Amino acid sequence: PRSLKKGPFIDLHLLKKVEKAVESGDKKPLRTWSRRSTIFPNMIGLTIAVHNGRQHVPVFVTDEMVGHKLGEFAPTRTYRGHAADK
Amino acid sequence: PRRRVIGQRKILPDPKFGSELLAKFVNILMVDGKKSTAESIVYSALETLAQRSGKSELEAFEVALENVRPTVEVKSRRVGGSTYQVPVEVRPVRRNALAMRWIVEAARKRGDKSMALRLANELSDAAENKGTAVKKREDVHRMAEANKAFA
Amino acid sequence: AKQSMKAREVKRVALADKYFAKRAELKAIISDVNASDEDRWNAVLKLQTLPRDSSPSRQRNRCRQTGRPHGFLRKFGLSRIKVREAAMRGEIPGLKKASW
Amino acid sequence: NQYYGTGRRKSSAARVFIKPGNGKIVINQRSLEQYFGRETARMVVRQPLELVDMVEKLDLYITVKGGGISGQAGAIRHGITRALMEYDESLRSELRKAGFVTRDARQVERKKVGLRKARRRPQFSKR
Amino acid sequence: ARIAGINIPDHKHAVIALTSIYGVGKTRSKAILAAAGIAEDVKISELSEGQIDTLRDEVAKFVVEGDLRREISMSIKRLMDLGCYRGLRHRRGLPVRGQRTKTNARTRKGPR
Amino acid sequence: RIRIRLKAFDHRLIDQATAEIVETAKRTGAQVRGPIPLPTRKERFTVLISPHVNKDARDQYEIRTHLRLVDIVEPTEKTVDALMRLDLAAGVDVQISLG
RNA sequence: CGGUCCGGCCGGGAACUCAAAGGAGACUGCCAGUGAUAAACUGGAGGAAGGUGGGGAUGACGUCAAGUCAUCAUGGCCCUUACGACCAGGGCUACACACGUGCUACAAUGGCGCAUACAAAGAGAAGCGACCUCGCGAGAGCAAGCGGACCUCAUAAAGUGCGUCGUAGUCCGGAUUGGAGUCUGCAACUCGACUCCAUGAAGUCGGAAUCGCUAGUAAUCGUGGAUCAGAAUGCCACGGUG
């Protein structure tokens, strides 16, 4: 994991989106291509349409996830079935 | 192997006693080039079985080794699935080496206290014609007469 | 290599040399433990503000004559094939066939 | 003004001086009990001395460097052999018969390219 | 010896005796003995009840048996409740760190 | 006090350089300690000469660098005038150390 | 040889270990036997060396429409609002498997705790990095010296000394998994490694059929170096034992 000296790492443009979401009026999901930005308690409740490679997937943020990267809740490749699951 | 008739490389002078046969035995026993541990183990087994027997160390080792040195082995110079086996009388040069190889093979077959104790029992009983190396030699000798149609 | 790939190397190295003065004096604040977290966080976010290929880590080592990512020698500065050609033609001083 | 002989085995250099002093041995500011680990090295570094009567007849102030334990033992053996040969000029025949004058030129072979070792090759792919 | 709900034979040393306890291992097996005033050389035999209870209290100081086991099970289930990539890899059972799972990983999976 | 170090790729171009520097020092000064050699360095390189899939076609290249050292013979002012002359033939690196 | 801070410490000593340049030196030269009165072979007085002393480089005519038009160049063919040009996020590292080349091993030839020697070859300038102190730890502040026979990387391991483990779900194997960090990198979730605690998969010598090696070679132990911000169980070389 990252050293505690530098602390959490988030995108610069992400902070502006987070601030605008909490102040004021959150109705549309926050669209971010950044997945390496750590989750903060300010984002709790708000919808994050995180890009994974094809299309932004909605993630609902709760207090359980704080010290985990936002990209963890975003599968990279679609899995249905190895034995030709039709 | 085809045109060259090799000689023989000299063996270690065996600093403890001076027995080239003992040097050959310890060289066969040692593995992975770890001479120190193998020599220590063989010396400890050397002492234990000599003091268990009572006679002189080397004078008992020679009489225990000559009692399971084989005389005739069986080989097969045939090609294909079908094979014919022919008995061949071993030369004295290979006789001691084969006996030592059988001894060291049979040594690592008992779950004793240590490798020295594993060596000691099967080294001492060879004088009385007991153990595993003598057991396999008395069957190798029977293999020659099992089918001696061609020799 | 490709013309665009070769131009990428010079475009990255130019911006890495231009911003080298800011990068070192900005990461110095982060490295200095005897500092406030309020300035540490500001330094951390300000480093991601400049363009990405502005660091020595974001550039490759394609050979000067042709351009080849895989296969390179720092001392000679060329790929393996070009180095061999130069050695056989005599362009590299004091280079012969090693045999020991 | 005492002369001496030099000896090397694989990559180790040992030079041993000969003086009339009876049996004073110290191997590079050490002794046989210090530079030890197995009786084979101690026996092999005294074979020219143990040949006829020179076990406790002249001292051995050798200092040896390089190589391993066996390499240092061989270097010391060759050095004392050469020193005794230069000292006496009549033990050379006995040393040649014992095989001590002939320096062992065998050294480690270089690692070839494509092979895992000097001669060991990678296993063929089941073909 | 009934230490933290486990039984220990009398033919072993104290280090392995503590190691046999689920959640003590090797370093704690020496730290507990050092804290209780016992060298890591004695056996289970010839062990006074005072030393037994001191060792038991030292073991109870840190985490424990099946309590710690369900301790860990809840921590693992936290990932699945989160639903992150790590939780999904736990659900699949194949990796949790992300090694080469496609060619040869026969450690958490297996046939009948 | 002062020393001169010579680095060369080949000994042919450094033996003549040492001879020239010692004869210049003999013309201007005396009491030379002789050019002392130092352990040469051999930098190796393994180049697979095949431009495609063949990990059996390798070439071993070697760069040799030989070191010579010349110390003071007579520390004066005239002896430095004849040693601060123009550089020798290209291929010999000369380093001047003073203290 | 002198003194000592007992240390090459330095005065000093240029024989040695060694440094890197030139030579001598092994050339069937000789002595016997063998052979066709030869070529050549066998043994030996000498030598560090004996028939190429031991290794490396050196790879013919040519075969395989052998492999690369994605190192590069090059003849046509193809697009010029796109097969061309820029950027963000994912994939080359992937759910039921098979195959190939290596590593750990299987244990009492062994791992474990505390002393203790023996090497060579290489790297180092926005790089190697002494010492002190915090550290159970990867490391962190402090940093001197070093473009390097000077200073570092870097008390080599095997072994050797002593106990301890007694053939055992083992003090055997460290694969999996959870907790919290240390270094480099705008940023290790997809995707590096190191460090602690715990957990302790198999395995308990492997079927047909197979791979390399004839001497400092096969095995077994450790280290350096290439590209490299970091990433070897791979590659390329030194050595220890053998």
DSSP assignments along chain D, one per residue: ---EEEEESSS-EEEEEEESSSS-EEESSS-TTTS-SSHHHHHHTSTTTTTTTGGGSSEEEEEEESS-HHHHHHHHHHHHHHHHHHHHSSTHHHHHHHT-SS-----PPPPPSSSSSSSPPPPP---
Q: Is the CB of F95 under 7 A from strand G?
A: yes
- Which contiguous run of DSSP H or E holds residue B58? helix B57-66
The nucleotide whose C1' lies nearest the CA of E15 is G171
List all residues 6 or more positions away from F34 whose beta carbon is below 8 Å from its beta carbon: F22
Task: Output helix, strand, coil percentages for chain C, rounded to the nearest 5.
Answer: 50, 5, 45
The nucleotide whose C1' lies nearest the CA of D106 is G216
Q: Is the CB of C81 under 7 A from strand G?
A: yes
- State the nearest Cα–Cα gap between C4 and chain A, in angstroms: 25
Cβ-Cβ contacts under 8 Å, D113 against chain F: 46, 58, 60
- F and D touching (3 or more beta-carbon pairs closer than 8 Å): yes
d(CA B88, CA B74) in angstroms, rounded, equals 6
DSSP type of residue F42: E
Resolution in A: 3.2
Interior angle at CA C24, CA C22 and CA C26, nearest 5: 65
Between the alpha carbon of residue D14 and those of residues A78, D54, D105, D108, E20, the distances in Å are 71, 19, 15, 19, 54
* Experimental method of this PDB entry: cryo-EM
Cβ atoms < 10 Å from Cβ of C12: 19
**Contact E98/A at CB under 8 A:** no
Q: Which residues in range 66-85 of chain E are in contact with strand G, contact meaning CB within 7 A of any of its atoms?
A: 72, 75-76, 78-79, 85
The answer to whether the CB atoms of A6 and C37 lie below 8 A apart is no
**Could you give phi then psi for residue C28, rounded to 5 degrees?**
-60, -40
Q: Classify the C-alpha dihedral A34-A37-A43-A44 as positive or negative.
A: positive
d(CA B121, CA B109) in angstroms, rounded, equals 11
Angle between helix axes B92-107 and B133-146 (nearest 10 degrees) is 130
Short-list C91, C27, C95, C97, CA closest to C65: C91
**Contact E74/A at CB under 8 A:** no
Short-list C81, C82, C77, C76, CA closest to C61: C77
- State the nearest Cα–Cα gap between D105 and chain F, in angstroms: 23
Short-list A6, A8, A53, A58, CA closest to A29: A58
Q: Which amino acid is at E59?
A: V
Question: Closest residue to G47 by CA to C1' distance?
Answer: D102
- How far from each other are the two terminal CA atoms of chain D, in whole angstroms? 68
Residue C1 belongs to a domain: yes
- State the nearest Cα–Cα gap between F8 and chain C, in angstroms: 9
List all residues 6 or more positions away from F41 whose beta carbon is below 8 Å from its beta carbon: F64, F65, F67
Q: Which amino acid is at A31?
A: R
Short-list D26, D21, D18, D22, CA closest to D2: D18
The answer to whether the CB atoms of D43 and B39 lie below 8 A apart is no
Cβ atoms < 10 Å from Cβ of D14: 28
The nucleotide whose C1' lies nearest the CA of F65 is G20
d(CA D17, CA D2) in angstroms, rounded, equals 7
- What are the tokens at F22? 């010692």
Cis amide prior to F97 (ω within 30 degrees): no
What residue in C sits closest to A14 (Cα-Cα)?
A: C45
Short-list B20, B28, B16, B12, CA closest to B103: B28
**Contact A5/C at CB under 8 A:** yes
Residues facing residue D16 across a β-bridge: D5, D62
Q: Which amino acid is at C72?
A: F
d(CA B46, CA C54) in angstroms, rounded, equals 73
Cβ atoms < 10 Å from Cβ of E86: 19
Q: Which amino acid is at C32?
A: D
Q: Which domain holds residue C54?
A: 1-90
Å between CA of B143 and C1' of G175:
47
- How far from each other are the two terminal CA atoms of chain F, in whole angstroms? 5
List all residues 6 or more positions away from C53 whose beta carbon is below 8 Å from its beta carbon: C8, C11, C12, C15, C16, C59
DSSP type of residue B12: P
Q: Is the CB of C68 under 7 A from strand G?
A: yes
- C and A touching (3 or more beta-carbon pairs closer than 8 Å): yes
Å between CA of B36 and C1' of G116:
17
Short-list A38, A35, A37, A40, CA closest to A75: A35
Interior angle at CA B88, CA B86 and CA B90, nearest 5: 160
Between the alpha carbon of residue C92 and those of residues A27, C76, C77, E80, F9, the distances in Å are 68, 8, 11, 61, 11
Q: Is the CB of C61 under 7 A from strand G?
A: yes
Q: Which amino acid is at B122?
A: E
Residues facing residue D3 across a β-bridge: none
Residue C97 belongs to a domain: no
- How far from each other are the two terminal CA atoms of chain C, in whole angstroms? 36
Short-list C42, A64, C35, A40, CA closest to E82: A64
d(CA B22, CA B11) in angstroms, rounded, equals 10
**Could you give phi then psi for residue D36, rounded to 5 degrees?**
-140, -170
d(CA A70, CA A36) in angstroms, rounded, equals 6
Q: Are strands A57-60 and B72-75 parallel, antiparallel or unpaired?
A: unpaired
Ramachandran region of residue D66, left (φ > 0), alpha (ψ -120 to 50) or beta? left
Check: CB of residue F42 under 8 Å from CB of residue F64: yes
Residue C67 belongs to a domain: yes
**Contact A16/C at CB under 8 A:** no
- What are the tokens at B53? 């027997």
**Contact D113/F at CB under 8 A:** yes
d(CA D62, CA D18) in angstroms, rounded, equals 9
Q: Which residues in range 110-139 of chain B are in contact with strand G, contact meaning CB within 7 A of any of its atoms?
A: 111-116
Q: Rounded to an integer, what is the distance from CA B40 to the centroid of its chain?
A: 19
The answer to whether the CB atoms of C37 and A7 lie below 8 A apart is yes
- Which contiguous run of DSSP H or E holds residue C85? helix C80-89
Between the alpha carbon of residue B93 and those of residues A77, B8, B82, E55, F33, the distances in Å are 70, 11, 31, 66, 64
The answer to whether the CB atoms of B36 and D37 lie below 8 A apart is yes
Residue C100 belongs to a domain: no
Q: Which amino acid is at B123?
A: L
Q: How many domains does chain C have?
A: 1
List all residues 6 or more positions away from F55 whose beta carbon is below 8 Å from its beta carbon: D114, F48
Q: Classify the C-alpha dihedral E22-E28-E32-E34 as positive or negative.
A: positive
Residue C59 belongs to a domain: yes
Q: Look-up: residue for tokens 């020991």?
A: C100
Cβ-Cβ contacts under 8 Å, C37 against chain A: 7
d(CA F43, CA F60) in angstroms, rounded, equals 10
Give the closest of D38, D44, D99 to B36, CB-based: D38
Residues facing residue F61 across a β-bridge: C97, F45
- B and F touching (3 or more beta-carbon pairs closer than 8 Å): no
